Amino acid sequence: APFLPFTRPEIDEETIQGVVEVLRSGWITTGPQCQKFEAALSEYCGGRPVRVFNSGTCTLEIGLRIAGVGPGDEVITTPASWVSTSNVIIETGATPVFADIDPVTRNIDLDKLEQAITPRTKAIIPVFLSGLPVDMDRLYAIARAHKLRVIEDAAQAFGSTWHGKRIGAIGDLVSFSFHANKNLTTIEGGALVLNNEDEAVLAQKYRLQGITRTGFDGMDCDVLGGKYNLTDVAARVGLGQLPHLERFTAQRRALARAYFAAFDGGAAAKLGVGLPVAEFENGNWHMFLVTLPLERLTITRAEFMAQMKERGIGTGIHYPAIHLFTLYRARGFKEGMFPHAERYGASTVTLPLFTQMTEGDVRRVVDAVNQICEQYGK
Amino acid sequence: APFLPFTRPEIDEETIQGVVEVLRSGWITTGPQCQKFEAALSEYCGGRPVRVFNSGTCTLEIGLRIAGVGPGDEVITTPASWVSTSNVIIETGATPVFADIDPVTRNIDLDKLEQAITPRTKAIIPVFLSGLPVDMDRLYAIARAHKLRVIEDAAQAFGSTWHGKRIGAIGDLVSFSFHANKNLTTIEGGALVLNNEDEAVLAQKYRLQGITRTGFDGMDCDVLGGKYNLTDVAARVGLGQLPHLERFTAQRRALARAYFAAFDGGAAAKLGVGLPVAEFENGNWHMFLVTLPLERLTITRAEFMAQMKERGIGTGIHYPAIHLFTLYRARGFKEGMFPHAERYGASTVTLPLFTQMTEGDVRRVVDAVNQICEQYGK
Q: For a FRET experiment, which of A278, A300, B214, B356 has its CA 20 to 30 Å from that of B167?
């Protein structure tokens, strides 16, 4: 059997031809394709202004800057996320504050978020882990009551909805990633959804060195911007992906259903492998995240992953707890501070989930997980 | 006649086919193409370690961080450059210090540079404007005598040499850009050349969030890194460009020679249009930069550029003086501080120069410049 990675993009020949056209045109960096992609994303978001960038990390940072976040301010987020989520807070000069996760959803616990608010809090970065939104009504009730800005880390949630409305069409500032591994890709890239045109102009300034050009020779810099513009090659890939979004999301929901059906009654389930929430309305099923019952295994997580690889199956880790990293320990974080995120971060494994998978592939994965639990379970 | 832009890339069919193969492979972000591109660049640089990035701006900032530059430190650079050159200094917390240009070369005046050294100076960022190196012997004599690090802003100078040695193979930390408009492109991208493998490891950490992965599930962050990795799509373009480097540089040299021959004795020269240095050994002729004699024209630079456009010729501005921008005026900079860079910044115009140009195109451009000077000269 061929090796089964945990993700793989699905890029059609029409999109590849589009990229060829862009390269042959000689107009290869930011240009008409980016304009078209911004317009398409804006219409997807119900007409809200959208600006595209070379990642879904800079979008977070720029969101914070638009919200006025800087030295002396606190921003609350989750430790169960990619480290950029809190590193961007540090980049602004602000102080990252963590709140623990709900062990069932693996997302930030909204009661713990509320409990972390102080007079210094200025913004919140919720993460939609696996593409699963939090309770968006509750999130914004908290933000409204405490007069906080929200920069949604929807990196994984392009195509997700909350009670029938799109992530991106609701809320405050919304950040998406189009990394290769995401449900829709531009190779690397991202987008920020704004509330109004003034915020979009500021976003544009931060995107490229704070520079505004006017006429043939007018130039000024009024903002300390960075280097964050997206190429037209990348934008063309995004434009080619968009018409497939609905189908991709449906495919991923079908695969997730197949996982639950396959796991039911097996050795892994019996041993205590922890499955994600079985819901098929809101999340876009970007990943299939399970937890190993470490106390009931005679092998480490690393060994478990090695055993999956021996069976030809790739796995990942999304994610170890941020606050236990060396840089964060130096800021004053320790074990015991976020027990749910710490248990999750030590035990989580990412199983294959991508649009070209078959039900057979799902059964192969579950077979391997069962076999390892049967052999090595206490 | 068709419109003549001031630049256009030259991307061949083998390269485009290569990008097609990368996309079909599903390995689209950082992977084996980036590894092969780093190896090729290392070879070009005489075996020095090289790391590639998503721009030639982050490479400058990372070079400063490797050099230990931060709050309280001064870094000397030129105001006649793209604003990222000094914005990266501010990003680190350090203080930018400007030194004026030599009006003949348009590069930083090394005596003015030396005059700007204080006990707070930690590093220098010379710019090789148009791809023209400074006197590299004098530059490093200064750096050694004052125990300063050098982060070369060689954005425009890939393929430039000094006394027959390659820019990149000499010097301290060397930063290149592979933007669409540069003599070799990766669509967008850059490279940093290091002195040793410890520097290269630090560069890698800064490249992607400070994260090191070990084994199946080991992960740590010990540095505040950013989001700066290059895609395999981009690296494949760079690999396809590299075999053309010598030919591209020769073509640009021949076009520059043709400009000098075409301008010689005409109305523009008589009025006072100022040409770049006529040397064909060191610089890679990335741009052909002229200065308008504004005191001898009845029209503005902007009107001069509009008149060129009426004649089907695109032009650019590289660059207005940085210290007169709003952000820099707020730091206390003002007119009269850098007279050569101010005069240059107000009067410079970029004429077409790219590998697919003909001798006829050069003559068309010069005809237009002569005609405008004849009409609007006083």
A: B356
- Residue B129 and residue B172 in one domain: yes
State whether residue B185 sits within 8 Å of chain A by CB.
yes
Q: Does B291 lie at the interface with A, CB-CB under 8 angstroms?
A: no
Say whether both A312 and A270 belong to one domain: yes
How far is A303 from A297, CA to CA, in rounded Å? 10
The answer to whether residues B249 and B209 belong to one domain is: no
Q: Which helix (H) or strand (E) holds B73?
A: none
Q: What is the helix (H) or strand (E) element at residue A50, kind and residue range?
A: strand A50-53
Closest CA to B231 of B57, B357, B371, B54: B54
CB contacts, 8 Å: A23 with chain B: 11, 15-16, 19, 237
- Report the C-alpha gap between A93 and A195 in whole angstroms: 24
Return the sign of the alpha-carbon dihedral for residues A343, A345, A351, A354: positive
Question: What secondary structure does DSSP assign to B301-313, as a single string?
Answer: HHHHHHHHHHTTB
- Domain holding A321, by residue range, is 245-378
- Of B3, B5, B6, nearest to B288 (Cα)? B6
DSSP secondary structure letter of residue A188: S
Alpha helix (H) ranges present in chain A? 13-25, 32-44, 58-66, 84-92, 110-115, 136-145, 197-207, 232-241, 245-263, 267-271, 301-310, 326-329, 339-347, 359-376
Chain-centroid distance of CA B288 in Å reads: 13
A250 shares a domain with A239: no
**Closest Cβ opposite residue A28 in set B187, B219, B231:** B187
Q: Give the end of a domain, one of A244, A263, A283.
A: A244
Straight-line distance from the first to the last Cα atom of chain A, in angstroms, rounded to the nearest whole number: 30
The Cα A347–Cα A365 span in angstroms is 18
- Any B CB within 8 A of A84 CB: yes
Same domain, A37 and A177: yes
- Please tell me whether residue A54 adopts helix, strand or coil conformation: coil
Q: Determined by which method? A: X-ray
User: Are B216 and A84 inside 8 Å of each other by CB?
Assistant: no
Q: A14, A221, A323: which to substitute to probe chain B, counting the most B Cβ within 10 Å?
A: A221
**Window 256-275 of B, Cβ < 8 Å to A:** none
CA distance A142 to chain B (A): 30
**Resolution for this PDB entry, in angstroms:** 1.6
Q: Which of B78, B133, B126, B59 is nearest to B285 (CA)?
A: B133
Residue type, A7: T
Q: With the CA atoms of A73, A78, A80 and A84 taken in that order, what torsion angle do they form, in degrees rounded to the nearest 10?
A: -30
Residue B176 contacts residue B158 (beta carbons within 8 Å):
yes
Instruction: Tell me the angle at which helices A197-207 and A58-66 cross, rounded to the nearest 10 degrees.
Output: 130
Q: Assess whether A11 and A111 both reside in one domain.
A: yes
State whether residue B20 sits within 8 Å of chain A by CB. Answer: yes
The number of distinct structural domains making up chain B is 2
How far does chain B reach from its first CA to its final CA, in angstroms?
A: 29
Contact status, residue B352 vs residue B249, Cβ threshold 8 Å:
no
The two three-digit tokens of residue B367, written as one number:
């005809």
Q: Domain containing A290 — which CATH number?
A: 3.90.1150.10
Structure tokens at A42: 């804006």
Contact A325 B87 (CB under 8 A): no
H or E segment at B254? Answer: helix B245-263
The contacts of residue A175 (CB under 8 Å, 6+ apart) are A56, A59, A60, A63, A151, A152, A153, A154, A155, A190, A191, A192, A193
**DSSP per position, B213-246:** EETTTEEEE-S---B-PPPHHHHHHHHHHGGGHH
Residue B46: φ, ψ to 5°: 80, 20
